[PDB]
Amino acid sequence: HHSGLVKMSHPSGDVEACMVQVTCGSMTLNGLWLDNTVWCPRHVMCPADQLSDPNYDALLISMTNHSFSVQKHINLRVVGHAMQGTLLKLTVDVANPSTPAYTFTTVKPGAAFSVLACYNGRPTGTFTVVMRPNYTIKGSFLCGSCGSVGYTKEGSVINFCYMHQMELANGTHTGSAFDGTMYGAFMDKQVHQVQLTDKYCSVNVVAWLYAAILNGCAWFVKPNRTSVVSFNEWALANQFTEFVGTQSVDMLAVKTGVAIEQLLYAIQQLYTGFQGKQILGSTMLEDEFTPEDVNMQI
Amino acid sequence: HHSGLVKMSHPSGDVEACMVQVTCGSMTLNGLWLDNTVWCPRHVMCPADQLSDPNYDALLISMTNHSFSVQKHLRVVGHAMQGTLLKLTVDVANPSTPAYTFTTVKPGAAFSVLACYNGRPTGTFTVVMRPNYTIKGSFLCGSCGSVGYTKEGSVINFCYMHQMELANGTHTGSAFDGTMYGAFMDKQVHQVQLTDKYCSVNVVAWLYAAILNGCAWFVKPNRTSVVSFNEWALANQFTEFVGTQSVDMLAVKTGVAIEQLLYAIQQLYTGFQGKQILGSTMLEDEFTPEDVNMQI
Numbered sequence: 047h048h049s050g051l052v053k054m055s056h057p058s059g060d061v062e063a064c065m066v067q068v069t070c071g072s073m074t075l076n077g078l079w080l081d082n083t084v085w086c087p088r089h090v091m092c093p094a095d096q097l098s099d100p101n102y103d104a105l106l107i108s109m110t111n112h113s114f115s116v117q118k119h120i121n122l123r124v125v126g127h128a129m130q131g132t133l134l135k136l137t138v139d140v141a142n143p144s145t146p147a148y149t150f151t152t153v154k155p156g157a158a159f160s161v162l163a164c165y166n167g168r169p170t171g172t173f174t175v176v177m178r179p180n181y182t183i184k185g186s187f188l189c190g191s192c193g194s195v196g197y198t199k200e201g202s203v204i205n206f207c208y209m210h211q212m213e214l215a216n217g218t219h220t221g222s223a224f225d226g227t228m229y230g231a232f233m234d235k236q237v238h239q240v241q242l243t244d245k246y247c248s249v250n251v252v253a254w255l256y257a258a259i260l261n262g263c264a265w266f267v268k269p270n271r272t273s274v275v276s277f278n279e280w281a282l283a284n285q286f287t288e289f290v291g292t293q294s295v296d297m298l299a300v301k302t303g304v305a306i307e308q309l310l311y312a313i314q315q316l317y318t319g320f321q322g323k324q325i326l327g328s329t330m331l332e333d334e335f336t337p338e339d340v341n342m343q344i
Numbered sequence: 345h346h347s348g349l350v351k352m353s354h355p356s357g358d359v360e361a362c363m364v365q366v367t368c369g370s371m372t373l374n375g376l377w378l379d380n381t382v383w384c385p386r387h388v389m390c391p392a393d394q395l396s397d398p399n400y401d402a403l404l405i406s407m408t409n410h411s412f413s414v415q416k417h418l419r420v421v422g423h424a425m426q427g428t429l430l431k432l433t434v435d436v437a438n439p440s441t442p443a444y445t446f447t448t449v450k451p452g453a454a455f456s457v458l459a460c461y462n463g464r465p466t467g468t469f470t471v472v473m474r475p476n477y478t479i480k481g482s483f484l485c486g487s488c489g490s491v492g493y494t495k496e497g498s499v500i501n502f503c504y505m506h507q508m509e510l511a512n513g514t515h516t517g518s519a520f521d522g523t524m525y526g527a528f529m530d531k532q533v534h535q536v537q538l539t540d541k542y543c544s545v546n547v548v549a550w551l552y553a554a555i556l557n558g559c560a561w562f563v564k565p566n567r568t569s570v571v572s573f574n575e576w577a578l579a580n581q582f583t584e585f586v587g588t589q590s591v592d593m594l595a596v597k598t599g600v601a602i603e604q605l606l607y608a609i610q611q612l613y614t615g616f617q618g619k620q621i622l623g624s625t626m627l628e629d630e631f632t633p634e635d636v637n638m639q640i
């Protein structure tokens with residue numbers, strides 16, 4: 047039986063209307079236009095030759111307002127420039143007439159968000175990703191994608207949580223939150239940086255097993271249980287995040303009647319392999335669906 | 345090494361702007377608003393009581409324009425039936441009607457779906473039209489009228505309007521000429537689904553992605569021609585392989601020939617024998633040649 051559990055993004059129209067192109071000298075990439083502000087990664091200020099140890103404090107001082115061209119496709123007059131962590135905060139003289147209600151909230155590991163991939167300020171595609179416990183994401187990003195933004199939507203309010211900066215050697219990616227911090231504390235310098243060891247997102251694995259139960263596949267449920275604190279002590283030493291319950295997990299426990307503690311026991315038995323059986327078409331544990339995904343799609 | 349090969353959907357903004365809610369009596373679902381026309385599935389005419397064997401020609405005759413309510417989160421002054429779809433004329437024109445066309449997608453092709461409930465877009469995902477003319481995706485009650493589309497430039501090709509769920513949890517709908525994909529009937533009755541098959545051209549594209557990603561252990565100088573593969577495929581639950589410029593592009597990027605990989609499919613179909621290809625132990629057939637060219 048097809049569960050109907052798929053990678054789903056938010057409709058991207060609200061964010062498409064905010065995408066612009068920012069050019070500084072030779073460098074061009076994407077920016078996010080909210081009210082009278084345009085956000086973009088600050089390495090747009092860096093010339094290709096000096097990208098390996100940029101002095102950003104000095105580059106900013108050396109700029110005027112005319113050093114930045116901002117174009118909307120999907121010109122703007124830059125009337126201020128400032129720097130916030132790894133991002134530029136440009137002020138423009140026209141308020142984006144299609145600004146959505148929004149917030150800036152950093153996301154934590156295990157949370158999913160949508161990404162609108164853009165090239166020269168033109169949206170080209172959207173996909174969903176999960177912030178990993180080593181503060182990376184997968185997805186698809188090519189040359190020119192920097193400034194592509196990731197977001198969620200709760201109600202009318204968009205939460206902007208990601209602005210794309212870089213690719214790492216193992217092919218994964220990272221970027222900034224809109225408070226300017228880089229996720230994982232990576233530096234926006236063109237140098238090899240090795241990511242930390244990854245981990246399974248325990249709360250998402252729980253959601254996925256609940257999804258399996260809701261889809262009729264529950265051979266792996268036994269009466270046996272492992273408490274949250276006991277699972278988390280075992281988690282530190284076998285590459286799993288701490289489990290923290292939510293009202294969203296709790297809805298799934300109520301619907302199925304299978305308790306969290308039974309699925310934490312199940313996880314301890316399953317992470318080695320399924321000894322010949324499948325769960326939701328898979329033979330490994332899946333951890334990129336969230337409790338909220340499962341409540342919405344099943 | 346993460347390949348960068350992911351399920352990617354088209355930006356949905358153009359289509360979000362066309363979604364409306366359609367109500368008829370006590371039923372509601374989604375419709376697509378292009379110029380002065382609102383498209384929606386005809387079973388919006390059916391009382392829930394009578395979904396098993398509706399008489400669509402009698403239901404249409406019993407309606408008036410004032411039977412239908414259109415709300416855009418709109419006054420109907422016309423109504424006709426085309427195949428399994430309604431074509432409602434309303435008095436206001438959609439000003440944000442994108443340039444568009446109407447195409448019927450073939451098996452193996454990918455399109456984007458904008459899933460909507462009560463006229464409100466809620467999610468977007470990419471599906472592949474299976475060789476049995478079903479799709480996966482995520483569709484709950486109220487999702488009918490959700491539309492699938494591709495893009496060729498700024499032009500939107502509307503290819504799908506969601507209609508129903510089959511016994512096994514898969515889905516199907518109409519093309520915009522009013523035909524159901526796979527000739528399924530828009531009635532709430534058990535219907536026999538043909539067994540699925542492997543889309544060979546997509547399997548080839550996935551193997552090319554692997555080679556570009558530096559995973560080429562399966563690449564031998566052995567070759568199978570298209571016609572031997574096709575003969576083999578008929579008996580082994582695969583589709584006819586048809587070459588394309590998109591595929592040729594990948595054989596030129598990698599220096600590996602289509603026939604080398606056709607040979608490879610015949611071996612890997614038996615299993616990878618302890619090895620992996622892009623984190624998988626089974627062949628993957630839902631990434632197209634176009635996906636791979638564009639994403640790698």
Ligand SMILES: *[C@H](O)[C@H](C[C@@H]1CCNC1=O)NC(=O)[C@H](CC(C)C)NC(=O)O[C@H]1CC[C@H](C(C)C)CC1
Pocket residue numbers: 373387395483484485486487488489507508509510511512515529530531532533
């Ligand atoms: C329109 O919104 C709706 C969507 C389906 C509802 C649930 N999931 C959907 O995809 N379509 C219908 O309700 C459709 C109308 C008929 C006139 C064709 N009926 C339908 O899809 O019925 C099916 C529901 C599920 C069952 C399974 C055996 C469980 C089979 C019939």
